[PDB]
């Protein structure tokens, strides 16, 4: 696996592990879901955790979070939303500016250079922006 999927699978964890004690709780998950505009019941959070909790200790460690990411096919409908969510002004293209905002909503306060490289990396046709298709590949 890439040296690159390491830091990548890592940050993903860090989105939830807000204290960074090393394990993910209902509380943390919960706060994350509220950031995303959802409001899950106590039972749903437990229930979400239960499906991946290999060792039955009610929390989620790093490798169980790998069980999460690997397991979950209706991709397009969820992605067309993500695009919509990013494309704040919905002109059909996501700008560096609009990307900054999103990373931030997630908590990652980025170097601008990282944001441009992010754009530079998903930008297929080279116009400086990410359009729907480019987004589709950046994401899939």
């Amino acid at each position: 696996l890439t040296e690159e999927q390491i830091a990548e699978f890592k940050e993903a964890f860090s989105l939830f592990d807000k204290d960074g004690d090393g394990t993910i709780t209902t509380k943390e998950l919960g706060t994350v879901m509220r950031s995303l505009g959802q409001n899950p019941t106590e039972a749903e959070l437990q229930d979400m955790i239960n499906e991946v909790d290999a060792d039955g200790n009610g929390t989620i460690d790093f490798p169980e979070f790998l069980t999460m990411m690997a397991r979950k096919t209706d991709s397009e409908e969820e992605i067309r939303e993500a695009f919509r969510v990013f494309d704040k002004d919905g002109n059909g293209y996501i700008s560096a500016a609009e990307l900054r905002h999103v990373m931030t909503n997630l908590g990652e306060k980025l170097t601008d250079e990282e944001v441009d490289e992010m754009i530079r990396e998903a930008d297929i046709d080279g116009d400086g922006q990410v359009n729907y298709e480019e987004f589709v590949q950046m994401m899939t």
């Binding site: 990548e8 940050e11 993903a12 998950l29 994350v32 209706d74 990373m103 994401m139």
Partner: peptide, 22 residues
């Protein structure tokens, strides 16, 4: 740094995808 987007995506799916368990 695509890490976090992937997660929001997943978990979102997860939440509905788990809540098809109620």
């Amino acid at each position: 740094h695509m890490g976090k987007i992937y997660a929001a995506m997943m978990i979102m799916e997860y939440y509905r995808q788990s809540k098809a368990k109620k």
